[model samples]
Target chain A: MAEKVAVLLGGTSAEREVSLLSGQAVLAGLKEAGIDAYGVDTKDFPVTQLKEQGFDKVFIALHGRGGEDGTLQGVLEFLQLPYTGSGVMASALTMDKLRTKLVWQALGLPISPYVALNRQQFETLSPEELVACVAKLGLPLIVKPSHESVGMSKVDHASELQKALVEAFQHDSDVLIEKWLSGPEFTVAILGDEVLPSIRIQPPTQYFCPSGLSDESEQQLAALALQAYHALDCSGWGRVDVMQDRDGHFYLLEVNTSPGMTSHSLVPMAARQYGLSFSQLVARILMLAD
Target chain B: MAEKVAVLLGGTSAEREVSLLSGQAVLAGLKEAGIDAYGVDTKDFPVTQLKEQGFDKVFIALHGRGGEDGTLQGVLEFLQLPYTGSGVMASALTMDKLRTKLVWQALGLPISPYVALNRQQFETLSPEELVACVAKLGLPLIVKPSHSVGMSKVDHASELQKALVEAFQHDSDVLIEKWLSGPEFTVAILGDEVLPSIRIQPPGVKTQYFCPSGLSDESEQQLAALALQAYHALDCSGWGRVDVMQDRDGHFYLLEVNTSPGMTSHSLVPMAARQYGLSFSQLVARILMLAD
Candidate 1:
């Protein structure tokens, strides 16, 4: 009998659209592979759906908040349904950026210096205080919504600092302030316990739009990115984004459990390096799902 | 506004009866102190009991399986409740004996030397091979169910060598250990964190039955006992227990954790120097219930 596969996507989060895109691609791939596939959206899932769905596995694509964080993972665990990507504990550990960074820092992993502030506390900080904090972090830092996924903005010390903070505040009730280290940015895709090839992002390197990535450097990064992937204990598979500092130190920036798998998505692009075609990549991922 | 308290006890686990006893004691104490207290027995819980009962806090008296092994903690975490005792991650980390002991040993904490064995692996080894393995561990070793809580029987080299094979059959795996020297003792009561004054106990010395008698060796054991107490960081106000073993050289050996250490039947009698008579016993239990 074919196993029931649930391609969960479209959460009530900012990343809902991206998740839906990923979900559609996965659903199509599962159907082509002759596997039983079901699409489960994020909003309003209960025991009833699980009982009747008869799914043996869940292919999670929902990103941000309820889906990306540990909540969905916990529900899956309670239902005892084997799912894809990180388990409940690892998902909980990775989804919280601040806490994940804390454990990483303690474990001696390299990361950019950052500070977390509540929404009210964030707005009240003096420009000089904020600058002082960033000054220690150096100029050209990144601003992020504390608990929100994506919505990352780069701010310069001389200008756009206020713009970045304002834009970030729209996403979450808190903010994460980080120093920007410029070099090369890379993303590695993990399949099960193994690491796939790496994809490089050269954001034009221009203050406004960095671009121009080399395939060779990306391939090289894919090799190094595997270390960080396993070190993070990301079961099944995950995406680790890394950046190089001026000192040639590669620092892990963010980890995405539900990275987009659209044609242009970095995970699929990386997966292609290992000879896994688009459909094959999705099926391969489902096979490796924890 | 009243401080909400949920006393979690009684489960479908092997230690259900013991947990019930502890839970009842905690429930009575919390209510007597005028804090809002509710009892949680797995036989009658679906989390709504906690929410409907209006509990703002949970005092987990669960032992073994669902309680100490992280399942219950995970359930609480899903509901976003701040429970007493350990968090889900910490509880999970500590529940697996191999993992916990490995972490502590790596951190340079002194622990008894032991070997982990799976069923097939033990079966594959010959009697001569087994004795050779035990020989390196030295005589008078402890054969334990790695995942079992509470103190069970320890096998001596001469007696339980064959029984070790029979005993190891109970659990999926076993931890064969080199027994430390004698003088088994227990230390009880930790602080909000483990605080000063570790309680010590020798299994043979449990005197809860007699209630108000002194151990014959009280004074000779006093200074060393107090030092071990301080080392274990047991607090009088919070609750914890430590069982220590004496080696041939007279050094103390730390073994096992009693996070939800036995109460009801085994709470008192170790309150030496603390004046734990009936007049003071109620206050002792009360102070442990309240936190900093």
Candidate 2:
């Protein structure tokens, strides 16, 4: 019998729709590669049933929380199944931006200075005191939910801090206040032991295919991205987001363990620029499954 | 509903025998406390069956890999079932000594100085080169599998170093650590508070109850605070066992954490709790009360 594959996606997370797109793309790519693969919408379907259903390997296409976090990985581990991407601890660690920054900062990795505030602290602090606490990071700060990558707000001044924090707090109990960086953003995709070419994400929309950086700078960025990835012990394949300061110094942003796999996803975009087709990229990733 | 409880134990991990005894002890204690509780050997039963089996809460008694690790906690989290002990991140992090020490050391917490050697590095290094690399930690070192809490002591620089390299094949990550002298002490955490410290002696040989841990007032406070910090740093709650080694100078070196610690007759958690005037039945009841 042919080895069976399960494309797990569509979890009950905020990124459900994006995951569905990625999952379908993966399913199509696997089928095109002549593999027996099936799509699993984890929200409705029980993932624990994958064992009884005869899945030989799992291609994790889901994003955020239940899927991207270590919960599903833990479940898969208990079933003694091989799944693509990072393991339990790494997944959980990467999911929380607060803990991720803590680990990286402890390792002497470059990251923008940020203040972590829990709900209890936020509740205890008066408005002026809250502003005074985060004032060190300066104005135009990015307020983000510690456990989430999306749902962040940029606060210009003291008055906007409380409102931005409350907005970000809706998604998590812990919030991060990072000093805003006015520079280009880059995303690096890691496949196996090799780091693919970096892609610069442009706002109001455009991605520079080759990152358009000097050869020396590109190498430095790739090296920094790889070090940050390993610092978190992220294995298999994933994407690392980074921000380069105005002085051309790159700071580690965050990691997406199970990055989006849509045709327009950053990982595929980087892979495509690096000479891998979408189908080939998907196949390549599946081949790297543990 | 009386809110039935299930004591999960006997996983596929190497510590299955220890878990079986723990689960049975917890079951008996819970029964003695007049609670509706039963034992479930995870090796024979699927943990997912708990939701349908009408178990309101879980008292995890299993140790090592599958049970002590975060896998079971993840399943319980998905099922929306309340279970005792640490959550997925802490359990998973605490299970891997390599990562645990990384986090602790990064946080400036005290752990023994050691070198983390992966299989690739060990394979690449020549025998003599390997000995020289680890010999800096000095003789009477401990060679341990990174993912396990078991310790193997080495005496000579050459024979011990070769034995350490051979043991590296059994595990992907291995540690060549400095051996801390003096009695080994363990601190137990119950719920939000730190319990009394108990010093352990030779296993199955001489059992010391209410161990004269021999730490001064300030040192005891510092050690307890550090243990609690380590526990919280790993995001652990409920109960856990932290092993510490006291050097001749009274500085403590962190060993490892046992999330689902043993609950057998010789277990130190209950022994420490017993010294606090809580019976075995009361101790189990207290654990259940903190279940969420």
Candidate 3:
């Protein structure tokens, strides 16, 4: 039983549109679960005022930079307010996908082969070097910015690789280009020691299904997700995205420290598969507040 | 001409006394350089209002967790107020001694042999199991928190349990490192240059600092060059310090990087700066000018 709580949402991140949806859903679910929770849009409300306003805890529902990155987490730590999900180090570490890959690659974790191309490399690389770098990852590679969720493209041709990288550089100076895996995608939910459930998502068709994989594969996915989350210093709750190569070996794609909580989000869908309702999952997640 | 600036000091950390020392020194140095600098204890002034108060830049003189960790850096970045020292990632990564070494290790940098453990391990593992976990590092292995202090040197295998208990007191994570039986040194970095190294002499519970690091012309240049690579690898900018130690064989190993290092005139960074031919005001003003 906590005192007043603030559900922080609608931040200044590029992903603000969905944050509102996530926060609204979370606020309603917390109320439905009979908790004293109120939605606070970070854009309109100064978080420094939360403690003064008698808010005891924070429920961060914002997505992307200002939301998921280390900034807000740092604020909460200074405020000494208990909040949900991962703390500052992991938030900042996982925010830049290039660093995320570097961590995983260094740790000998399973991940898609990739190359980090910075702005200087982009500008200084001769055409020969650019082709040579791209050749390491092969064709049909995904070029995504290290920060923004935007500026991402799958280059199916060698000609498209250079242009795709230039476009990717618009959002962030550093870009991560990964060799695409030719298998279905999956996301596993991590709630402390438990890997709640795995969801197989086909974004091409906008179809999301949890517990859709074979039993053995799903178990392997859950185990893999837990290590990656903790290895990245993530605590409380998080979601790990994964992809399978042709041999059915699971490869890490990325981590979502603060995954979406809307009815359609993968975390909620995965929790439901674990027999947790939306309200049950929210309450369970909040109790682990640091 | 610089905009009105804030020299943040005396934060809510264990080492807040030195924080006050740093900020007051930084404020005086900045003003002597004719900067419109004002001292503000972050514990008193909310950094969230820095932008509202017309503060164009910040000189972070605070140290330890809340100051040097990514938390303060995050707020400064969010405020979009230019601040001295490393960005969020480098600050957080360096604050985490284990993860700092992990990233450096991944890059094939020289680091001491170590093992990292969490709260659960020491909390549940039996004395037999615990001793086995840390014994591989040899006797006199050092045990300390990954991100903070309260460390002990395990002189005997029987003392391992006592060391780990003391180690986990600062944070949930612990680092057991191979002891380096050689001298210790710290290197200062301003903009792109690495200052001369400083040697640390542990005189009992107290310590003394030395510049020129007693290294030969060639060796001093070598550590300075290697120090810059480790500094840049962590993406540290503006001004910072990298601590390095030599193995028994005299090969250097990176100890840690400081994003917001000490700023007192007698502090290591300033000590190294004085040897670099820059006065306190010149170094402080140069640090502010480097802000983006």
TM-score of each: 0.60, 0.92, 0.94
Alpha carbon lDDT of residue B150, candidate 3? 87
Model 3 steric clash pairs: none
The root-mean-square deviation over C-alpha atoms between each candidate and the true structure, in angstroms, is 9.1, 2.7, 2.3
> Global CA lDDT of candidate 1, please?
0.62
Residue A193 lDDT in model 2? 79
CA-based DockQ, model 2: 0.59
Judged by DockQ cut-offs, the docking class of candidate 3 is medium
lDDT of 1 by residue, A118-235 (tens): 5666667886676665667767777887555367787765467667777878877657888778767766777875677665576643211111345665555555566455444466
Fnat per predicted structure, each in turn? 0.03, 0.50, 0.70
Report iRMS values in order: 5.8, 1.6, 1.4
Docking class of 2: medium
Model 3 stretches with alpha carbons more than 4 Å out: B123-136
Error of 1 at A91 (Å): 1.7
Give the C-alpha miss distance for residue B50 in model 3, angstroms. Answer: 2.3
